[PDB]
RNA sequence: AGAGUUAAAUUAUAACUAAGCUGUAAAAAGCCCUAGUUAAAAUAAAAUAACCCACGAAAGUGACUCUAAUAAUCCUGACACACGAUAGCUAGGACCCAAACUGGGAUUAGAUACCCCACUAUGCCUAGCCCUAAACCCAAAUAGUUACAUAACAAAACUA
RNA sequence: AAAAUG
């Protein structure tokens, strides 16, 4: 007869899932500028989940894509291209302390 | 739908009468796929250069 | 007679919902050298640092400004049944009752 | 041998600081991971060892982890008691 | 599109490539291969100095031909292009548009697994 | 971040083979780990040389 | 003073001179430092070999040229050898993990030659040919 | 065996209005020339469905799934005719028969006339 | 399961420099047709990604591309059918590198072992056999439950 | 590095 209990209904404080920086994103084998944000500048080895921050998805085809590249022709292997240097950093690894 | 969107795209087909039109214009219109992004998830281009 | 379900509704922590980021008037019961013992009321009593700015101020029974994180710091480890409770509260400081 | 030299793995010297330029190339080398590679591809292992391997050493960041997750958590705990003699 | 090639032309002159595209989309033509677009790529610096038809290459231009061809077909034309001496790498993959692109639903919190060991005091 | 451990050990509820494999039992302490000593080496062999280069030349 | 770490590539436009040569014209020193010896030799930039010093030619013998001494000797001799040829600045290139690494690295400094980039080009096979059975069966 | 045309306009483009009136480009790309075998896996399904089967929307029968696997072990078949060393598609064509076997089994022990 | 391709290293092969190279706790033996750098086919294997846990019934599989393709409107079930790591056998081809055996050099009282060097069978491809593993996750398959209830340890106790 | 037995 109590008006006040509580309703058996959905959380409304649901706050959104953390999204990887390419959700509902377009991963290509062609974008070399995009696949060498993730490569390291000095060695070229491809950064992990620790390091890009990306959900399960988008980790695997971004090494698929960088894999394929490397071999089509698009990108070199042992280093990051210079005039791709210079982008912007994604990856939280640090290098020079 | 799929069928209506094809028969557009049939008008821009390479064909015989194409290829020396369209190897032309290839040859002159280079085209990119280089974006990049950044921490907050937006894409930036380079063709603002 | 008023019953419980009643009260719950109409308490305070109940219209404050979730506990993060939340702007809530606590006050200092406990005063150590450095840290401030500041019970903003809910269930615990967060700790908090003694600021450069009017530092002189704080005593016991200042009432003062806070921006609640986590009503409760308590997390899972390996090998553990339950939680490791903290006994404490996670609040930063941003004023003394301006008023 | 088919890319271009002095690209790859190569750090310059700023001021004629050699020690510390090298101190970088080495930083680089470890955090990729090139300098346990070369000690481990010295010699040959069993893919039965190499499971092995792989397996200790996950345990023992999964624990390592954790036990800094704990210390951080408890870290606010440091602070002096205030009450001594209770 | 269904099929996509990635050309990598030997660096040259203009009615040279020109010549050179021209008879490989006659080629693939001829296999019974709709060709969609032509895209150029540009000329750029080859990541590495590929070796092929005993020549070292170190420019490269490079190409992109999308079409529709039958699963039936697609190794000849790559037979055809590897004895093709203009062609530095031919390369025949799927269309990346024709993999539709699925829902990035976000990182889900996975929490940490628990009843893994049994309740007995150490 | 921590790596995950669902699907890591076998048990009787996991129908996959076994990732981890622990030598012991992944229960954490209550205790760390003494902090290591480091080891010694010898010291200025590089002052030492320039010492004995002026006793093998004069 | 914005200074990068990054090499010099000949493809950008610029400007970095030592004692008037670009980076491209200066001379290279291979350095391989093995786990038994430490070989030097300094090239220049058409690859022509300019000095060569190695711990065994510094009158060494079995496992004394191991040490990082004779590492430090070995570099002051092909130091020796390169400023007898007229040559300033040298950019050392490291094979190999031993060590006699960074002693035969600073022996050049010690030699009279200074270091303006210094480049790891170690041998890492991606799982190339097969390495020997592993020591203490 | 069975010959599938390769201009067959297939089964995902056959039943919407207007397919005759396009040109042949696109009669082309909407056939079996530019399609992939599981298309005409599906094809001959539908072909052997209308001529074998009495019910073609009652699928949950037997005798319906008697000839869904009956094209796959036909496939299977002509895999192996050029896979010779392939085991694992060899103990899946082996596996299909004796799955249809038991069905068919099954349908004589429950509907004969079905089952001749 | 087929077909095509190779980024790093390695090597047969040429050119400049040096008298040494490799080798271990230390040595000796071996190679000085040796070593460093610049170029270089064929074979073998497939760094980081992987702090990922997916595929396959299991063995097993993570360099790239294409084709074919991963049974059952889904219970258990053999001595019947089909697979089955490495090791081994037969025929043809391949052989950078690793290595049983073997021959030298160390240590030992002895060392037909652990340590160093060289090399063969073998590891590689096609075809045909052999049908063995600590083939173990020592936990059988199918649908379930957290009720009673810790021989000990370990991966908790149990139902039809 | 070495190194047996009661
Ligand atoms: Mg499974
Ligand atoms: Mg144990
Ligand atoms: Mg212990
Ligand atoms: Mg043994
Ligand atoms: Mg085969
Ligand atoms: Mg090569
Ligand atoms: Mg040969
Ligand atoms: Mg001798
Ligand atoms: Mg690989
Ligand atoms: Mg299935
Ligand atoms: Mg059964
Ligand atoms: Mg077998
Ligand atoms: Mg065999
Ligand atoms: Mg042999
Ligand atoms: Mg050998
Ligand atoms: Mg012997
Ligand atoms: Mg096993
Ligand atoms: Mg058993
Ligand atoms: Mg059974
Ligand atoms: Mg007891
Ligand atoms: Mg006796
Ligand atoms: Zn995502």
Redesign the pocket.
């Given at each position: 007869s109590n008006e006040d209990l509580p309703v058996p209904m959905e959380n409304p404080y649901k706050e959104p899932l953390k999204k990887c920086i390419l959700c509902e994103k377009h991963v290509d084998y062609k974008n070399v500028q995009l696949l060498s944000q993730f490569?390291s500048p000095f060695?070229?080895?491809?950064?992990?989940?620790?390091i890009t921050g990306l959900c399960?998805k988008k980790?695997?085809e971004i090494?698929?894509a960088i894999?394929?590249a490397?071999?089509?022709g698009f990108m070199p292997?042992?280093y990051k291209d210079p005039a791709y240097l210079k982008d912007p950093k994604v990856c939280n690894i640090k290098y020079r302390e | 739908q799929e069928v209506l969107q094809l028969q557009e795209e049939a008008k821009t087909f390479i064909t015989r009468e194409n290829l020396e039109a369209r190897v032309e214009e290839a040859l002159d219109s280079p085209k990119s796929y280089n974006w990049a992004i950044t921490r907050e998830g937006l894409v930036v281009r380079p063709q603002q250069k | 007679v008023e019953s419980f379900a009643s009260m719950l509704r109409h308490s305070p922590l109940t219209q404050m919902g979730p506990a993060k980021n939340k702007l809530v008037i606590g006050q200092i019961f406990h005063i150590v050298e450095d840290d401030l013992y500041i019970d903003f009321g809910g269930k615990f009593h967060c700790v908090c640092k003694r600021p450069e700015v009017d530092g002189e101020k704080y005593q016991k029974g200042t009432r003062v400004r806070l921006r609640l994180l986590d009503l409760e710091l308590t997390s899972r480890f390996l090998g553990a049944t339950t939680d490791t409770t903290i006994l404490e509260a996670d609040a930063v400081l941003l004023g003394l009752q301006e008023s | 041998?088919?890319?271009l030299?002095f690209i790859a793995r190569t750090v310059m010297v700023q001021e004629g600081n050699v020690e510390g330029a090298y101190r970088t190339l080495n930083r680089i080398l470890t955090m990729?991971?090139?300098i346990e590679?070369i000690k481990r591809r010295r010699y040959?292992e069993k893919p039965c060892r190499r499971r092995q391997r792989?397996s200790y050493?996950?345990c023992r960041?999964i624990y390592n982890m954790e036990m800094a997750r704990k210390i951080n958590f408890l870290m606010r705990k440091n602070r002096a008691d205030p009450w001594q003699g209770c | 599109p269904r099929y996509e090639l990635a050309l990598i032309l030997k660096a040259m002159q203009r009615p040279e490539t020109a010549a050179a595209l021209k008879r490989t989309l006659e080629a693939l033509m001829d296999r019974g291969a709709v060709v969609r677009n032509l895209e150029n790529l540009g000329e750029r610096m080859l990541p590495?100095?590929?070796?092929?038809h005993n020549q070292?290459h170190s420019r490269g231009g490079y190409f992109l031909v999308d079409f529709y061809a039958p699963?039936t077909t697609?190794?000849s034309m790559?037979?055809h292009l590897?004895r093709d001496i203009d062609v530095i790498?031919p390369?025949?993959?799927?269309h990346p548009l024709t993999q539709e692109v699925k829902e990035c639903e976000g990182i889900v919190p996975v929490p940490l697994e628990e009843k893994l060991?049994?309740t007995?005091k150490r | 971040a921590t790596?995950?451990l669902r699907?890591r050990?076998?048990?009787?509820?996991?129908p996959?083979?076994?990732?981890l494999k622990?030598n012991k039992?992944l229960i954490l302490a209550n205790h760390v780990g003494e902090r290591r000593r480091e080891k010694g080496e010898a010291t200025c062999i590089t002052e030492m040389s320039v010492m004995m280069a002026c006793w093998k030349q004069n | 003073s914005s200074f990068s770490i990054y090499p010099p590539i000949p493809g950008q436009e610029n400007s970095l001179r030592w004692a008037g040569k670009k980076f491209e014209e200066i001379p290279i020193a291979?350095i391989?430092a093995?786990?038994?010896?430490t070989?030097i030799?300094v090239?220049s930039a058409a690859?022509?070999?300019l000095a060569?010093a190695?711990?065994?030619?510094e009158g060494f013998?079995?496992?004394?040229?191991?040490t990082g001494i004779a590492a430090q000797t070995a570099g002051i001799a092909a130091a020796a050898k390169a400023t007898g040829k007229g040559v300033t600045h040298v950019r050392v290139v490291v094979?190999g993990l031993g060590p006699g690494r960074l002693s035969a690295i600073k022996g050049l400094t010690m030699g009279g030659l200074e270091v303006i980039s210094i480049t790891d080009?170690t041998?890492?096979?991606?799982?190339?040919?097969?390495?020997?059975?592993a020591?203490?069966? | 065996q069975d010959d599938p045309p390769p201009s067959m306009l297939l089964l995902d483009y056959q039943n919407v209005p207007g397919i005759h009136k396009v040109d042949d480009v696109v009669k082309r790309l909407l056939s079996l020339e530019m399609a992939?075998?599981?298309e005409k896996?599906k094809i001959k399904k539908m072909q052997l469905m209308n001529k074998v089967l009495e019910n073609p929307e009652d699928?949950?029968s037997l005798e319906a799934?008697i000839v869904?696997?009956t094209v796959?072990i036909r496939?299977y078949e002509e895999?192996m005719q050029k896979?010779?060393?392939?085991?694992?598609?060899?103990?899946?064509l082996?596996?299909?028969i004796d799955?249809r076997k038991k069905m068919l089994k099954n349908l004589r022990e429950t509907n004969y006339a079905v089952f001749e």
């Open positions: 490569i060695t070229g080895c491809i950064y992990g989940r620790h399960g980790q695997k090494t698929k894999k394929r490397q071999i089509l292997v042992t | - | - | 041998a088919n890319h030299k990729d991971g090139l590679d040959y792989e050493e996950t960041r | 590495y100095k590929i070796s092929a070292r699963a697609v190794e790559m037979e590897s790498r390369n025949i993959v799927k060991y049994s007995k | 790596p995950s699907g050990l076998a048990r009787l509820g996991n996959r083979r076994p990732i622990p039992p | 291979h391989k093995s786990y038994n010896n070989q030799q090239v690859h022509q070999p060569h190695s711990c065994g030619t013998r079995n496992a004394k040229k191991g094979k080009n041998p890492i096979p991606h799982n190339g040919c097969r390495p020997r059975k020591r203490r069966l | 992939n075998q599981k896996l699928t949950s799934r869904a696997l796959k496939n895999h896979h010779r060393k392939d085991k694992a598609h060899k103990r899946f082996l596996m299909s799955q």
